[PDB]
Amino acid sequence: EEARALGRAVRMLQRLEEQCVDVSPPSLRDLLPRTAQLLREVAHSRRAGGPGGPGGSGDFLLIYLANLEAKSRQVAALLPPRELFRAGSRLRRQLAKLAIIFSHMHAELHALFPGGKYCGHMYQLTKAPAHTFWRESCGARCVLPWAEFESLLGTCHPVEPGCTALALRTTIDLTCSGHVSIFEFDVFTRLFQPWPTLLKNWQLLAVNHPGYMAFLTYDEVQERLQACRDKPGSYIFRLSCTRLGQWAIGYVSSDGSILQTIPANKPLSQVLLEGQKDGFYLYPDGKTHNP
Amino acid sequence: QRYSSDPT
Ligand SMILES: [Ca+2]
Description:
Number of domains of chain A: 3
Protein name (chain B): Epidermal growth factor receptor
CATH topology of the largest domain in chain A: Transcription Elongation Factor S-II, Chain A
Radius of gyration of chain A: 20 Å
GO molecular function, one term (chain A): zinc ion binding
Helix content of chain B: under 10%
Bound molecules: calcium ion
Structural class of chain A: alpha+beta
Order of helices and strands of chain A: HHHHHEHHEHHHEEEHE
Distance between the termini of chain A: 52 Å
Subcellular location (chain B): Cell membrane; Endoplasmic reticulum membrane; Golgi apparatus membrane; Nucleus membrane
Largest sheet of chain A: 4 strands, mixed
Strand order of the largest sheet of chain A: 5-4-3-6
Oligomer: heterodimer
Number of helices of chain B: 0
Strand content of chain A: 5-15%
Order of helices and strands of chain B: E
CATH class of the largest domain in chain A: Mainly Alpha
Keywords (chain A): Calcium, Metal-binding, Phosphoprotein, Repeat, SH3-binding, Transferase, Ubl conjugation, Ubl conjugation pathway, Zinc, Zinc-finger
Distance between the termini of chain B: 18 Å
CATH architecture of the largest domain in chain A: Up-down Bundle
Number of strands of chain A: 6
Shape of chain B: rod-shaped
Family (chain B): Belongs to the protein kinase superfamily. Tyr protein kinase family. EGF receptor subfamily.
Largest sheet of chain B: none
Shape of chain A: globular
Number of strands of chain B: 1
């Protein structure tokens, strides 16, 4: 049932781990066995729950496992039986993007079933109003399909249907599963604080801001900023993979070095203004027009 | 070294 699902997903990540035996986060060779190990722990703890019904622990696992399988098939399809170094290598980018997604699915699973043991009914968000929004709208649930989440979020922060809502969905759905967990919502509301202007912060900082990069790794940021070494004060920003919920700002320093920093942890709008004023964050993605 | 000090 659930146990059969969990056995299948374990063996599937072991296959991928063996197919990856040919580093620096996010690393598939690290994430796959850690995710497998956590799933072994989930399997044993459920053979013993939180409140059942829609969006409880069982629902989360069903959705999570069906997504993990889809993503594992994508990875499997890029790997030979037992070139990454060509410029513009499609294989390198697809693997990098998939490693990002496994990094997020590993973090989400660890947040909600640490040691195998479900805590989605007790989970507390980092920002208080976001916490209160979730629990007053979704109760003890830990996950929602996008459409229901969109509808619920709209009681407070409505998003224009169509292109904008899909852009929002892409930003929030870190695991690319079509569902929003309490964890994902935690991550989003930390990144785009403060709460009273949530979606306007998002519009300004992500949709309309040339410095915003989605689904880039640390090494992809170092590589992109190569183009800007002669432009001190060029910068971009993206979600940290190792510190989920925090921004990683990549910038070109005074000496043409490419540095990356985590500004723990005020609204990004304030970090940006303060860098602008001081002369560190002047040219988003190397371009003239700082928003 | 990976992530460096916030240059504020
Ligand atoms: Ca998701």
